[PDB]
Amino acid sequence: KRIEMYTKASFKASNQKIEQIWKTQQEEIQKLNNEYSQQFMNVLQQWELDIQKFEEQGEKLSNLFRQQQKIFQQSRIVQSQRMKAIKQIHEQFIKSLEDVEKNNDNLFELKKEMAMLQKKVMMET
Amino acid sequence: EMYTKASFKASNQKIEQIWKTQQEEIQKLNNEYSQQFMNVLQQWELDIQKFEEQGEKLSNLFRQQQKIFQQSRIVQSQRMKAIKQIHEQFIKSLEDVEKNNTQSELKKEMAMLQKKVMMET
Amino acid sequence: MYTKASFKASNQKIEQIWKTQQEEIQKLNNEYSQQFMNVLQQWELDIQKFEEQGEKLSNLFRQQQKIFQQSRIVQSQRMKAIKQIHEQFIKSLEDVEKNNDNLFTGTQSELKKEMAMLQKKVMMETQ
Amino acid sequence: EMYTKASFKASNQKIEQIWKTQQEEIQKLNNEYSQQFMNVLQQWELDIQKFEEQGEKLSNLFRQQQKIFQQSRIVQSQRMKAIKQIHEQFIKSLEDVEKNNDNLFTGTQSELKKEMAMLQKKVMMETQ
């Protein structure tokens, strides 16, 4: 009766110390598991922030690309437009000279003035 | 009279000849210029097309690198989301097993030990 | 006297015609050279502005290259850091498991020491 | 005396067995996680290489295209010189031809006046 109670008290105190040994070692493993999770969680949050900066950086240069691209197309067509222009100018020059040369054949007007000088000459004689 | 008309006609010739001789010189100057000019302009049309084609390629190369740029951003963000998924599953699993535990089965076998020491005593 | 007068009259009218026709030509020549030079100088500039944009592209291409290189570098740092964290975790468990398995200070020996005490405590008052 | 020592030793061994089996379960989870984790890192490390290989290949195709762009800009300048030269020589030739035509003694007006002056002399001579 009494012996049986005293041995129940001591079992409950040993049981308590046996738990605490188990708990202490599981608490220590938990602080490692947690400390490991925070460092691991902070590295992915940093990487996420890094991808954010990465994408914001790439987006500016996408707009910068665009402005140069419209300017780059305009300069291209002007380079070919100028060139057509000088071809046009040369072709109108050459044609306006051919046109002149045609009236040269008409003039070889001289013979008219000589026939007139000859008429005056004979009239004298 | 005949002697006059003859004289006028030989003179008329020599004057028309001086003129045309002088015209032909310039018109041969004109002709060789046009030809040389139009020949160089024509290969130049080609060269300037080539120019515009290299500038066109350099422009496609940027479009290719921005594609890769965005492809790299998508695959990082997916790898990163999957790393985080495995980790959170692992943490939840440990949290699950901890919550389950152990201290009762200790108390059970201590009861059994007590039972046999009461029995023996 | 009459014949010489009308000969010099004709000569002058002849020299003028030659001269007019020459002035027309030389007017076309100089008008053409003038335009030609104005449009070539202008072409020299537009060509030189094309180089400018083609050069700004190169600098934007190179700019993105560096950024592309920089992400790569950072990613490899981010990976090197989370590998170092993980392996520091893993070895930290190994060393915790090492102390718990200790023949004289680990948890099984501390259990046995409690069981050692309880059993003599119970035997003492019972017998 | 003997009955209690062997009863206590059997229970030591049972408890330590309770301990071990839960420890083995946790170490099972830690190992399965470590494998899966070191698996996605090696894929990430492959990912890193594949974009560098894409980066590097584009960089070298870009320098090649810029070199060809620069050899096309040099050609624009050579074409410019040639056409400038050809026009310069045309004008300069035009000028030389008009001086020679405007020479006082041998120009084309003084050939027009010489021809004219013979003709006038042919006419007068005979009429006398």
- The full 3-state SS of chain C, as one line of letters, equals CHHHHHHHHHHHHHHHHHHHHHHHHHHHHHHHHHHHHHHHHHHHHHHHHHHHHHHHHHHHHHHHHHHHHHHHHHHHHHHHHHHHHHHHHHHHHHHHHHHHCCCCCCHHHHHHHHHHHHHHHHHHHHC
DSSP secondary structure code for residue D107 in this structure = S
Q: Does C48 touch chain A (CB under 8 A)?
A: no
Residues 6+ apart with CB under 8 A from D126: B3, B4
Do residues C107 and C100 lie in contact, with contact meaning Cβ atoms separated by under 8 Å?
yes
Q: Which tokens is C69 given?
A: 């290189």
Resolution of the PDB structure in angstroms: 2.3
Distance CA(A120)–CA(D73), nearest Å, equals 69
Q: Which tokens is D51 given?
A: 């974009």
The letter for the amino acid at A31 is K
**Burial of C25 per CB tally in 10 Å (0-12, 13-18, 19+):** buried
How near does any CA of chain D get to the CA of A118, in Å? 10
DSSP secondary structure code for residue D51 in this structure = H
Distance CA(B19)–CA(A108), nearest Å, equals 8
Distance CA(A43)–CA(D123), nearest Å, equals 118
Residue D15's φ and ψ, nearest 5 degrees, are: -70, -55
| Whether B34 and A122 lie within 8 Å, measured CB to CB | no
Q: What is the Cβ-side half-sphere exposure of residue D92, based on CA atoms within 13 angstroms?
A: 6
Residues 6+ apart with CB under 8 A from B118: A4, A7
| Whether C63 and A61 lie within 8 Å, measured CB to CB | yes
How near does any CA of chain B get to the CA of D104, in Å? 15
> What is the maximum span of chain A, computed from C-alpha positions, in angstroms?
186
Q: Does C111 touch chain A (CB under 8 A)?
A: yes
The letter for the amino acid at B46 is L
Q: Which tokens is C45 given?
A: 């500039």
Closest CA to B65 of D8, A118, C69, D97: C69
Distance CA(D126)–CA(B4), nearest Å, equals 9
Query: Helix D108-127 and helix C2-100: axis angle, to 10°?
Result: 170
| Whether D76 and C47 lie within 8 Å, measured CB to CB | yes
Integer CA distances (angstroms), C27 to B86, C21, D87, in order: 88, 10, 16
Neighbours of C9 (CB within 10 A): 14
Do residues C116 and D11 lie in contact, with contact meaning Cβ atoms separated by under 8 Å?
no
Report domain extents, chain B. 2-120
Distance CA(D67)–CA(B99), nearest Å, equals 68
Q: What angle do CA C39, C43, C46 make, to 5 degrees?
A: 140
DSSP secondary structure code for residue A108 in this structure = -
Q: Which tokens is B90 given?
A: 């692992």
Helix (H), strand (E) at residue B34: helix B2-100
Q: Which tokens is D60 given?
A: 């070298």
Distance CA(C81)–CA(D103), nearest Å, equals 93
The letter for the amino acid at A105 is D
Closest CA to B106 of A1, D21, C126, D3: D21
Distance CA(A58)–CA(C67), nearest Å, equals 8
**D81-90: long-range contacts, CB 8 A cutoff, minimum separation 24:** D82/B40, D83/B37, D83/B40, D83/B41, D83/B44, D83/C40, D84/C40, D86/B33, D86/B36, D86/B37, D86/B40, D87/B33, D87/B37, D87/C33, D87/C36, D87/C37, D90/B29, D90/B33
Q: Does D33 touch chain A (CB under 8 A)?
A: no
Which residues of chain D make contact with C112, given a CB cutoff of 8 A? Answer: 12
Distance CA(A11)–CA(D11), nearest Å, equals 13
Distance of CA D58 to the CA centre of its chain: 9
Cα dihedral B47, B50, B54, B55 sign: positive
Give the nearest partner residue to A121 out of D19, D26, D123, using CB atoms: D123
The runs of H, that is alpha helices, within chain D are 2-101, 108-127
Torsion of CA A97, A100, A105, A108, to 10 degrees: -120
State which approach was used to obtain the coordinates. Answer: X-ray
Distance CA(D104)–CA(D123), nearest Å, equals 26
Do residues B102 and D22 lie in contact, with contact meaning Cβ atoms separated by under 8 Å?
yes
Which residue in this structure is represented by tokens 């008290």? A9
| Whether C127 and B117 lie within 8 Å, measured CB to CB | no
